[PDB]
Design a binder for this molecule. Structure first.
Ligand SMILES: CC(C)CCC[C@@H](C)[C@H]1CC[C@H]2[C@@H]3CC=C4C[C@@H](O)CC[C@]4(C)[C@H]3CC[C@]12C
Lengths: 246, 113, 120, 33, 107, 287, 123, 29
């Protein structure tokens, strides 16, 4: 079985094939393993032909001595490792080593930028962040040995139906700034390096104003005190005129 | 564990403060400063203390079918009736004081003669 | 038997356990050994200068020297929030402000009353 | 943007009645003089 | 057959396998896909009746769900004694002005 | 299904170990596998019936025993730094009737040379930047757990006392701080992305939690620093806004207005007592 | 459709199954039977009611169905989903009612003062 | 609109004006 991570654009047809040359086996299956978990059975066939279980489809060729698996409508939630296995009528299943698979998503409106996050007041680090890319961009490792770069990952936020790419850099030393951080990588033109002048929209902060029951009670008490001042002040002004008009 | 089995469950959306007793039984009995205060069957597992802005204190216990547990003293102070004192606060209080004593003093002036 | 005492003055929390007459005392916060060698331990106290709400909150215990922490008597759970130049308003501090302010303004009106009485 | 029961309509209400009172009293005072 | 009602970060979402039909109540906002509806923030009390349709061998069936929230955010905690104190002091204040007028009435 | 215990284990050179496998769907025969980078799955021992055990492919250093029909434990006689792997346990019904194995969840072992190499993580939290909030109107938080050994952490996010699973991406593999040495430490990161109006509330509470797996209370520790054991380490933040009017300052305004109106009402009651007493004294002295 | 009824007063929630006018009614909360066994004195049942005393927000909030006796819970096709925050002596105001109380207060006081002034001139 | 300080400062101006202007009207009568 051929290893090596292969990158597939999202919404395509994937082809994996093993060659078992040569013996005479009788029972075939496929497994799937996510990261840091255990294997899991997907499909179990022992005839020549097709046995569909949804969008998964397998082929067996006895005289040609290769099997195959086909996935259609490939989501980004299929990035795993796939293991082909075969056996005789007896025990001791024989495994292959597996094949890593990667499906990269559609990213319809890109907007790349590099941001400087605020400090922590508990550690002496400072992190930069290079976010949503267009998924063709390759992120390289660092050259100095005091700078740490990570690989690129994908996150899915479902409260807005949105997905993105990210990569994080951090360091201890001085003369580390976000304008020179991802210098070793090839970078798209017209990414957005911001300026240190502030910009705080005030109409956006009013969109999250809350209220408890204590604030309601205290506002109503202020409203009551204003009325009592009006009545007592009316009394004092009525009595201060009778004593001097006489 | 050493007979320490009353823990606090914090930072909910409403300001509520809860307590979970750690024993395998049903019909949990709660105590506060020795005297009994409650009665909790199954399908509820957490005793409610109220909101944290009224800042509860006290010493609490639970028992199951074995002996009682050791107490747990709780102490909140989330101040919530505080005023920060600045130049603006002190300036406003002084100015209101001066103008009110001026109006009252003019009134007493026409009262006397 | 006797609970712990908590004393807050500014941004300094000082807490005290009077449960052991004479011994050497160790403290422990969230199962991590605290005090000795910001933070300082007296003979019987535990000073905490510049208290932070999120960092210091949770379980405290005091136990004598040479024992285990799972044996002491009971724990303290505290959750505080401090301020510098902040005064809090009870139903007694307000009454002191009202009564003292009435007793201050009640003299100037009598001085103006006799001053204007002996003018005309 | 949930005010609840902290709307500015209540504070501005209790000011607005007092404004109407002051305007009417200045009107009658100019009516006499 | 339940309609799944999920609560992401501070909003309420009606989730189904096909498109959702309004019946009455809060209208909402369709996302970039069909089959999900956004009822807005939780503290503004969304209330309504929604109806979906079936696939995934519940096929050729139908169900309905009613949503009710009461996040009590315009609410005051008042005892049955404080109401008495407020009513008594306001009565005493009005009688105090009423005593103040007819000491002015003849002078 | 198949269950096995423990999940994570660290042990020094020259120490035995027993790790269990259990099963209750009445299958009868069981196996043990191990897995390495660039080698695949390799067989260790198998037991075709209750009492009968054979050998497999890499059996040197291991010992099995099949007594009952639900249990099949494995022993390491004396462990060496080549025993570092991940160990799986599989089960089948009967001898080629339906070739469907059922693997367990896994168990990770590391074998060091000395217990002075073990360390717990350190966690920090980094608050989002203002340029992202004004440019895209979303906010991203970052958590860094750096400097731990061995490689047995688990990371999570908790908002207002509850776990979240939407909007999170953790690195799949921990990285090494210097990737040329042998006994080097590790590091690992994570993200949380959230809408802008949910970060601007000062009432919400965020935190990043890390579960570590280290020593226990049967180990000898003669070192100056504290004993690295199994614990939880974390870091927290409140939401906050830069400019404008929150519900933190409205409270300040209402409190100051309450005290001002209480003082003024007190002065007015003093003046009422004065002029009432003067009118009563006058009406008495008219007679 | 005929909706359910939710009535809240203090810390007591009273639901009302709307559909079935002349049969016997069981209830179920997150696929577990509730009420109708003289267990949990806080939880009662009537001809078409379900009383929940000392309601809790965190627990006891979710789905609720009603079905007639002699049928299965899986043949139900109309559910309820509720959350509620309750505490004792916590009423629900508005914005217009507070302003009506203020305005009526001022007008009653002014009417009393005009009446007492004319009556005192007519002495 | 949002900041209620303007409402309090506006309340402290009209009250004194409405007292002084009232006591100056009934005297001319
Ligand atoms: C008005 C007189 C007769 C009686 C009471 C005094 C008046 C002036 C009171 C009532 C409410 C008060 C205000 C309430 C709140 C604030 C906000 C604070 O940041 C500065 C002071 C300031 C602006 C106060 C100034 C004084 C004030 C206007």
């Amino acid at each position: 079985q051929d290893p090596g991570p292969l990158s597939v654009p999202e919404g395509a047809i994937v082809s994996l094939n093993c060659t078992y040359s040569n013996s005479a086996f009788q029972y075939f299956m496929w497994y799937r393993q996510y990261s840091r978990k255990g294997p899991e059975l997907l499909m179990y066939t022992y005839s020549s032909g097709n046995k569909e279980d949804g969008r998964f489809t397998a082929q067996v060729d006895k005289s040609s001595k290769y099997i195959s698996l086909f996935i259609r409508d490939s989501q980004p939630s299929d990035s795993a490792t796939y293991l082909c296995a075969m056996s005789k009528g007896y025990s001791t299943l024989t495994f292959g080593k597996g094949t890593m698979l990667l499906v990269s998503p559609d990213i319809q409106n890109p907007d790349p930028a590099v941001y400087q996050l605020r400090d922590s007041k508990s550690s002496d680090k400072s992190v930069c962040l290079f976010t949503d890319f267009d998924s063709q961009t390759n992120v390289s490792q660092s050259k100095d040995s005091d700078v740490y770069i990570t690989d690129k990952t994908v996150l899915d936020m479902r409260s807005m139906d949105f997905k993105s790419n990210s990569a994080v850099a951090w360091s201890n030393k001085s003369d580390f700034a976000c304008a020179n951080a991802f210098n070793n990588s090839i970078i798209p033109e017209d990414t957005f390096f911001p300026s240190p002048e502030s910009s705080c929209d005030v109409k956006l902060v009013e969109k999250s104003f809350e209220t408890d029951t204590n604030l309601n009670f205290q506002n109503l008490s202020v409203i009551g005190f204003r009325i009592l001042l009006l009545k007592v002040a009316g009394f004092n002004l009525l009595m201060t005129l009778r004593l001097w008009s006489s | 564990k050493g007979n320490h089995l009353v823990k606090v469950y914090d930072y909910q959306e409403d300001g509520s403060v809860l307590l979970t007793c750690d024993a395998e039984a049903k019909n949990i009995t709660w105590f506060k400063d020795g005297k009994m205060i409650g009665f909790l069957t199954e399908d509820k597992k957490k005793w409610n203390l109220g909101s944290n802005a009224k800042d509860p204190r006290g010493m609490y216990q639970c028992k199951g079918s074995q002996n009682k547990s050791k107490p747990l003293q709780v102490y909140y102070r989330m101040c919530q009736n505080c005023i920060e004192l600045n130049a603006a606060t002190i300036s406003g209080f002084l100015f209101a004081e001066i103008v009110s004593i001026f109006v009252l003093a003019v009134g007493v002036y026409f009262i006397a003669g | 038997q006797t609970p712990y005492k908590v004393s807050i003055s500014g941004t300094t929390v000082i807490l005290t356990c009077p449960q052991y007459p004479g011994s050497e005392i160790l403290w422990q916060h969230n199962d991590k050994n605290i005090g000795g060698d910001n933070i300082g331990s007296d003979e019987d106290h535990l000073s905490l200068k510049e208290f932070s709400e999120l960092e210091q909150s949770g379980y405290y215990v005091c136990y004598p020297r040479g024992s285990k922490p799972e044996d002491a008597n009971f724990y303290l759970y505290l959750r505080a929030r401090v301020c510098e130049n902040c005064m809090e308003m009870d139903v007694m501090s307000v009454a002191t402000i009202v009564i003292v302010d009435i007793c201050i303004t009640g003299g100037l009106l009598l001085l103006v009353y006799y001053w204007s009485k002996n003018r005309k | 943007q949930s005010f609840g029961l902290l709307d500015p309509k209540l504070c501005y209400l209790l000011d607005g009645i007092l404004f109407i009172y002051g305007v009417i009293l200045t009107a009658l005072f100019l009516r006499v003089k | 057959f339940k309609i799944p009602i999920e609560e992401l970060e501070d909003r309420v979402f009606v989730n189904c396998n096909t498109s959702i039909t309004w019946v009455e109540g809060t209208v909402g906002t369709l996302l970039s896909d069909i089959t999900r509806l956004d009822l807005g923030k939780r503290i503004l009390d969304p209330r309504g009746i929604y109806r979906c349709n079936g696939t995934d061998i519940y096929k050729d069936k139908e169900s309905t769900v009613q949503v009710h929230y009461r996040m009590c955010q315009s609410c005051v905690e008042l005892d049955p004694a404080t109401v008495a104190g407020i009513i008594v002091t306001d009565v005493i204040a009005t009688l105090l002005l009423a005593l103040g007028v007819f000491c002015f009435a003849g002078h | 299904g198949v269950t096995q215990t423990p999940k994570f284990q660290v042990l020094k050179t020259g120490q035995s170990m027993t790790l269990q496998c259990a099963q209750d769907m009445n299958h009868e025969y069981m196996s043990w596998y191990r897995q390495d980078p660039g080698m695949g799955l390799r067989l260790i021992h198998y037991s075709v019936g209750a009492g009968i055990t054979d050998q497999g492919e890499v059996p040197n250093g291991y010992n099995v025993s099949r007594s009952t029909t639900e249990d099949f434990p494995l022993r390491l006689l004396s462990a060496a730094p080549s025993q570092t792997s991940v160990y799986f346990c599989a089960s089948r019904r009967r001898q080629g009737a339906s070739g469907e194995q059922y693997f367990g969840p896994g168990t990770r072992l590391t074998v060091t040379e000395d217990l002075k190499n073990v360390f717990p993580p350190e966690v920090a939290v980094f608050e989002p930047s203002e340029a992202e909030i004004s440019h895209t109107q979303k906010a991203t938080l970052v958590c860094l757990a750096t400097g731990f050994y061995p490689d047995h952490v688990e990371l999570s996010w908790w908002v207002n006392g509850k776990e979240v699973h939407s909007g999170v991406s953790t690195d799949p593999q921990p990285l090494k701080e210097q990737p040329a040495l042998n006994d080097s430490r590790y590091c690992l990161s994570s993200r949380l992305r959230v809408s802008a109006t949910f970060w601007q509330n000062p009432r919400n509470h965020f935190r990043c939690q890390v579960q570590f797996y280290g020593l226990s209370e049967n180990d000898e520790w003669t070192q100056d620093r504290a004993k690295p054991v199994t614990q939880i380490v974390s870091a927290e933040a409140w939401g906050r806004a830069d400019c404008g009017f929150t519900s933190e300052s409205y409270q300040q305004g209402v409190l100051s207005a309450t005290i001002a109106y209480e003082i003024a009402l007190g002065k007015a009651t003093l003046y009422a007592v004065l002029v009432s007493a003067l009118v009563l004294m006058a009406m008495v002295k008219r007679k």
